[PDB]
């Protein structure tokens, strides 16, 4: 009853920055699924988009649910689409944010919808400055950015600053993080709190 409003949500997976990719490769997609399970994906509510790979190239696509097609298939489709990211490893966050901006520019949005980028990351961008530059173009267009950080390879101050908070001080509703062992229990609440803040 929380993630129930008109929102265009762009889910961006950004990892792994780690030397031992096992955790990201085994758990990033189940983590993203858990987040997506918090969303009301009725056409009058949340429209869910995801950055994915197709024909060796990065692309933004809409994810549907539960479409008029069979239940298990709709789940499998989403899970496979998300999994196209895994073979490609670490990719430019700057380029991903730029693609979201182009996507928003190419289409008319719903009159009363909010635009939101949710980033799942276990590392830091190739370029901090290029990334910050893009995020500000987005926020200048009224787009909100939330970030979920995982593990010990993240920079918390960067994540907080990226979503518009103070680098260290004060609560930041658009940011949360966790160690791998705990992410499954923290991500649901994070998505909910993100929806709440977005409606304010
Ligand atoms: Cl980058």
TrEMBL record:
Residue span, VWFA domain: 8-194
Disulfide links within the chain: 3-195, 165-172
Compartments reported by the entry: Cell membrane; Membrane
Protein name per UniProt: Thrombospondin-related anonymous protein
Organism field: Plasmodium falciparum (isolate 3D7)
Organism ancestry: Eukaryota, Sar, Alveolata, Apicomplexa, Aconoidasida
């Amino acid at each position: 009853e929380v993630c129930n409003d008109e929102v265009d949500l762009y889910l961006l997976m950004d990892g792994s920055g780690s030397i031992r990719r096992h955790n990201w490769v085994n758990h990033a997609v189940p983590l993203a699924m858990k987040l997506i399970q918090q969303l009301n994906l009725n056409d009058n509510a949340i429209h869910l988009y995801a950055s994915v790979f197709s024909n060796n190239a990065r692309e933004i696509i809409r994810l549907h649910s539960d479409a008029s097609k069979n239940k298990e298939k709709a789940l499998i489709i989403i899970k496979s689409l998300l999994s196209t990211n895994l073979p490609y490893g670490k990719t430019s966050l700057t380029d991903a944010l730029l693609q979201v901006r182009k996507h928003l520019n190419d289409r008319i949005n719903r009159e009363n919808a909010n635009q939101l980028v949710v980033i799942l990351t276990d590392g830091i961008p190739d370029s901090i400055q290029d990334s910050l530059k893009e995020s500000r173009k987005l926020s200048d267009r009224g787009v909100k950015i939330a970030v979920f950080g995982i593990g010990q390879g993240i920079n918390v101050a960067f994540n907080r600053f990226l979503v518009g908070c103070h680098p260290s001080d004060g609560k930041c509703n658009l940011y949360a993080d966790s160690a791998w062992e705990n992410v499954k229990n923290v991500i649901g609440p994070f998505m909910k709190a993100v929806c709440v803040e977005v409606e304010k």
